[PDB]
Design goal:
Blueprint (H helix, E strand, L loop, with lengths): L2 E2 L2 E2 L3 E2 L17 E2 L2 E2 L9 H8 L8 H7 L7 E4 L3 E4 L13 E3 L2 E3 L8 E3 L9 H16 L7 E2 L18 H7 L10
Parallel strand pairs: 3-7, 4-11, 5-10, 6-10
Antiparallel strand pairs: 1-2, 6-7, 8-9
Bound molecules: zinc ion (ZN).
């Protein structure tokens, strides 16, 4: 994949206005697949911008209203129109999940330099996302090799048929395109 100034190339730079710090240490290389929307990169929905400005009202549900108090920071957010946004480079650890576990490894927090996908009410995801994500993932695997067999989300803690409250990211398409437990070297 292209890299420019040691930053991820062909992406929109949106470095989060307040990063996190979590007291955990596991090698950062986990791919997180789920449809979320939290940061106001580009949209016209006032709820997302209200979070960052701070005027969010405890109406939607408790989790979102709760976590508002804590700043958020993702890593690479791919929007539903096949766009790549980058919030928080490989320098100064982020937080965007709560908890997740895969292959007898639980991550207490989203303490890994993965990806996150963004959409709004399952608005057309543009298959292009999967293709471009797979390209980024090829680079990321070649950087830190884990992701090649470590793809999960927040509901994929055990059953891969669910990945969040809205998967539909075609596990057969993605797993075939990405490293299929072959076309790898070293480990
Ligand atoms: Zn999630």
């Amino acid at each position: 994949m292209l890299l420019d100034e040691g930053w991820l190339a062909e992406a929109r730079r949106v470095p989060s206005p307040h990063y996190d710090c979590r007291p955990d240490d596991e090698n950062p290389s986990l791919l997180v697949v789920h449809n979320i929307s939290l940061p106001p990169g580009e949209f016209g929905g006032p709820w997302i911008d209200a979070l960052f400005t701070g005027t969010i009202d405890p109406n939607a549900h408790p989790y979102f209203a709760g976590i508002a108090h804590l700043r958020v920071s993702a890593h690479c957010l791919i929007r539903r129109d096949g766009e790549i946004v980058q919030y928080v480079p490989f320098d100064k650890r982020a937080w965007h999940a709560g908890v997740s576990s895969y292959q007898g490894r639980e991550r207490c927090n989203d303490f890994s330099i993965g990806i996150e996908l963004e959409g709004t009410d399952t608005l057309a995801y543009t298959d292009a996302q999967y293709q471009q994500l797979a390209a980024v993932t090829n680079a990321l695997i070649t950087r830190y090799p884990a992701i090649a067999n470590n793809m999960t989300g927040h509901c994929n803690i055990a059953p891969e048929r669910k990945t969040d409250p809205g998967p539909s990211f075609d596990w057969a398409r993605f797993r075939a395109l990405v490293t299929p437990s072959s076309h790898k070297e070293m480990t």
